[PDB]
Amino acid sequence: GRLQEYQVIGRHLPTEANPNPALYRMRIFAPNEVVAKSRFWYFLRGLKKVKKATGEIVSVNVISEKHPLKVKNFGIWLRYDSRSGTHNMYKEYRETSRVAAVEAMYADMAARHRARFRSIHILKVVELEKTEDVKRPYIKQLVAKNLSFPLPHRVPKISTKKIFSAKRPSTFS
Amino acid sequence: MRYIHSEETIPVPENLKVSIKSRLVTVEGPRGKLQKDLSHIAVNFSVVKKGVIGLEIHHGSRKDVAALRTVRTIINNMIIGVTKGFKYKMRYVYAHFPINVNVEKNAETGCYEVEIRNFIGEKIVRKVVMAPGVEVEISKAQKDELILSGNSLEAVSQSAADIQQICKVRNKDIRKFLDGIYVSEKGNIVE
Amino acid sequence: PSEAGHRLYVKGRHLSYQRGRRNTHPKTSLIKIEGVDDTAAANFYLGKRVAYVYRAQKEVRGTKIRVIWGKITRPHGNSGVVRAKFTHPLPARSFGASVRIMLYPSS
Amino acid sequence: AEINVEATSWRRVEVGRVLKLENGSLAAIVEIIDHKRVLADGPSSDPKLATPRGIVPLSRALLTPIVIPKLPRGARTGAVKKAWEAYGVDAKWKETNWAKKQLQQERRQSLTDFDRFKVMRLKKQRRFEERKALAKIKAAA
Amino acid sequence: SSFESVVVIDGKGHLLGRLASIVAKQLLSGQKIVVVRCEALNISGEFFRAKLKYHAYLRKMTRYNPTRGGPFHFRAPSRIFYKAVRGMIPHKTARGAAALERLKVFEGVPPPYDKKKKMVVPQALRVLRLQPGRKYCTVGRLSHEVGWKYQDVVARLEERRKAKGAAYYERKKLAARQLSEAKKAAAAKVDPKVSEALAAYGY
Amino acid sequence: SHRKYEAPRHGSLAFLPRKRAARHRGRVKSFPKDDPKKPVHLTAAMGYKAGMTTIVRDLDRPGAKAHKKEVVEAVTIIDCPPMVVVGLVGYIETPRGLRSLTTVWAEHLSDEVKRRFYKNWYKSKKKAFTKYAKKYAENNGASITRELERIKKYCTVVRVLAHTQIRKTPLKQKKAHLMEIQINGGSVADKVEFGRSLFEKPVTIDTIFEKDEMIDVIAVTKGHGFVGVTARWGTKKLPRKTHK
RNA sequence: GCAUCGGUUCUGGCGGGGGGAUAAAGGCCCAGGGAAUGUGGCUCCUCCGGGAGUGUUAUAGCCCUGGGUGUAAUACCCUCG
RNA sequence: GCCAGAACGCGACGAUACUACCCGCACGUUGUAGACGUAUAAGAAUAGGCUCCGGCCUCGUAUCCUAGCAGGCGAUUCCUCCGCCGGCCUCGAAGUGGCCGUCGGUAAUUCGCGUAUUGCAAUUUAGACACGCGCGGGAUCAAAUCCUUUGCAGACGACUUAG
Ligand SMILES: [Mg+2]
Ligand SMILES: [Mg+2]
Ligand SMILES: [Mg+2]
Ligand SMILES: [Mg+2]
Ligand SMILES: [Mg+2]
Ligand SMILES: [Mg+2]
Ligand SMILES: [Mg+2]
Ligand SMILES: [Mg+2]
Ligand SMILES: [Mg+2]
Ligand SMILES: [Mg+2]
Ligand SMILES: [Mg+2]
Ligand SMILES: [Mg+2]
Ligand SMILES: [Mg+2]
Ligand SMILES: [Mg+2]
Ligand SMILES: [Mg+2]
Ligand SMILES: [Mg+2]
Ligand SMILES: [Mg+2]
Ligand SMILES: [Mg+2]
To answer: Which residue intervals define the domain Large ribosomal subunit protein eL14 in the entry (chain D) (predicted)?
Structure first.
């Protein structure tokens, strides 16, 4: 959907035997902070013996892109469920922010592999600092020197209410 | 995965002229003229240098790019045919019954006609008419040869295949009955 | 001399009633005004008056032509069609006829 | 070796090429993201032509014949403005046929009812002198 | 939108099913439509696909009596287009029957409907809808392999009217050339101040 | 369940609508394909049927059993008095078929043809072509020569109107029969010129046909009133002990 | 039919206030450090457009860290008219 | 090729008494799936086109027409635009357009008289197709069925013939 990145911090409820428990922090992509907390309890239930009934939320914040006007390449590590078994992949994207890559990845996996949102786990997102660490060949072509290309056969835009044109259109925009 | 730029080039020798208009190619040289229509393929033609023709495809798929090399060699074949021609040879293969042919001359039109008699001792006289621009000759170099020559590879080759496909044995083991006429060599008229 | 015409109204067509998929309500109608495309342009004609004129057979008070009066109520859809309400529901045989849209309550 | 080719030639999507957005705005391309999106901005003194910095889809843009030479790839807003004024982009675009057509349109949507009557009477006066010359040439044949 | 008395549509280059949807809506609104050159329409997909679709159509016929009730398979290009439109109109009611009376279809250009302006529907043009590289066919060819008999007659007549129109173009070209010289000659000589007054108004 | 033993169907569905013919005179539906390199010639004739008889001749069919031996064959005789040409017609090609646009008649018509246009000729006034005849000898027949010029310009096929002389047969009937015969020839100008020169003249059958030529015969068969299935289609009769 | 009001409701435009990294960016200015899809120079090849190499701002510019102008502007969320 | 021929699909021709047919204008009982500027003819390509050969093309957001009592009466002015008739050419896919000529009308410029009262809105009863009528002009003077008869036909009608 339309996402944005959060950080959320949780804690086991303090007790007389264990005052000052440990603190855990995650980065979660979610449409809003109501479901940002819900995903935190889901991921934490698979790593530590903590529930929502016996825990509490310390802080939730919003992380914004540092340079949302610079183009950069990203790489994503993820796991998902197929119709039989689980698998690991690693894909790449080219855009300006961290948030849109997760948006692009979710739409990409839904089309090529029929994978829904229910069955995708995000492991790590890292911005590729150099240019020789780009692996996939559909991004290597977009970083070639002196890139330029034309746009042949592009349909002109005509109002959808204007029927019965009086002359033949042209496709040389 | 769509490829941004795929390009090929065709050199042109300093003997002939070529003109392209609305994806219709006309090649004219010392030995004649040929035309081909390529309106079914989306290709962009251009003049790279003083004697080099370039062609390319933008934002094409894997299937679309495949046709790019097919177009290049077809046009190159046209250039070769108008300056060097083509030449095919055929041989007669029989065990007992000799095969007799009669390449009669032009039949009031440019077409040649070939008559084949006494195939495996049959009473059919079977007749095939060649495409225009193709001339059929009986060789004098050695025995049992048919020589086909012309300007266009497509017409010469298809007509040669017409002769081979007409001499067929039916209801017999074809590993034993090797009777027929077969093509044996392909080349140009010059050199 | 004076070759110009005499027109002070905008022409429209009577399309159909207001309906679901199997039920129709003759109380209100739908009218397509000529030259209006979006719902922003259709806001200009809210509250105007529309007329439907037709030919009868008998003469009553010096004429053979009757009129039914109505006015525009609200826009309809995203294509500039509008709703209208008349003193009597339209004759239901005029699906494709023409109506006149005035400009009386101006500005 | 005569070669004659009659084929089309489009305008390239390069760096320094200036687009024309839908609402009459100009932007210079500084970075190519995909085959569908680019990063562009236009620093213009005229508030009508100026546009902010951001990403623009290529399906809502038109390619104008103006191209800025030697624009470094990925330049900042400050460096783009220096080349924008040096090349005289604002003056170059004003004299194109696309600009004149837009200006000729704008004068027409703003016409008073009294002014619409005025242009009808003036057209007839010019139309009268046209038919006099047309008949003279047609008669000569 | 606009209301004309009658509109004439040139059929060459239009997809069969997309043009019929636009037409069927206009007829029920109150418009009058005339479709010309129905033999030059188009269908998406390879020709062999269309032929198999029609052959399956030909197999339907009433069993106990083929002279009544059975689907009658018309073979003309105008009749194929007419069948497509008839499926998008409630033709079993008086309102639907009246709508169909506002439609006329022909092969070629009959004498009443040449010397007329022919419109184009841009939401059904092939060059603006189909993806380059795909395959299409022509309705005219499909009618040939099902029993249409007057293909060559229409081809000959169309060559005659296009030759007549070539001479009409020469007269039209001459008239425009003469009108241009009049405007250049008249405007300079006479009008002292009407020019810039008109120019500031956008004319 | 399936049919026990197989057998072909009775009758044919090609000649299916078994109703009385619409018209007594036989109707020709197609003519031989035109060839513009042959000389102009007619392609049909029409006569009355007399009877049959027997002939004897010797056979020339090499390799046969009866080669060079006498055979006995049956033949049929057709009475054929000469026909008279009356007029000609022209057709044009349209996207809906063929249609006729003009026709011209001869100046004088016999009383045989005029009987055809009436159902009670005896008490009529016999004014069939009286006003049409005045088109001749009026402006030197300008109206007639105008239509002939039209056919030379717009038409593609030309036919001729002819009738029989039934008065030269032992028949009681006095009403003649009329039909159209197509002219297959070199050119449309040649077709009309040849056709126009034959007005009110007789033509004999020896000019149309010639010996040992293969022809076709069109007519209406002998009638029977109203018959059951056994004779009409030819089905097997039911056993002798069948009720009803 | 119009003007002035009452009940219900749909739909446009304008002026303010609060919050978050007291938005993040961004423009101009100051200090330090880097690199390549290496600008200008310099070397070589190609005259046939140009290509290859060297090397850190010069006759183009970009990236990273800290500070000033700042309680900057704007987006999103909430709220008084 | 061959068989049937839509009984609500179409064309050519013959003779047409009774005003049924043709021409002129005169009104209007009467009809209609719906006039209100009902104004616009190249062909062809769309990974190419148009042209006045100088150039032009995302865009019909265009072009033509458009003032006066529902549009009067005169004048100063101006050779434009429109219409009814007539004669020569032309048009066959379901036959159309062009040229010439006589006559009637006419703000491109600038003025003089007339408009009220329909009373503060109420269709602006105005278009062209048919059809029924009324005059006064022209041309025209026909057939079909029953009945008697035939057997190339037949349950009865119908069909092929004769009077
Ligand atoms: Mg064997
Ligand atoms: Mg069947
Ligand atoms: Mg029926
Ligand atoms: Mg059984
Ligand atoms: Mg009998
Ligand atoms: Mg039998
Ligand atoms: Mg019994
Ligand atoms: Mg209120
Ligand atoms: Mg604020
Ligand atoms: Mg260097
Ligand atoms: Mg900083
Ligand atoms: Mg500060
Ligand atoms: Mg701050
Ligand atoms: Mg602030
Ligand atoms: Mg019939
Ligand atoms: Mg009477
Ligand atoms: Mg006059
Ligand atoms: Mg009278």
So the answer is: 52-127
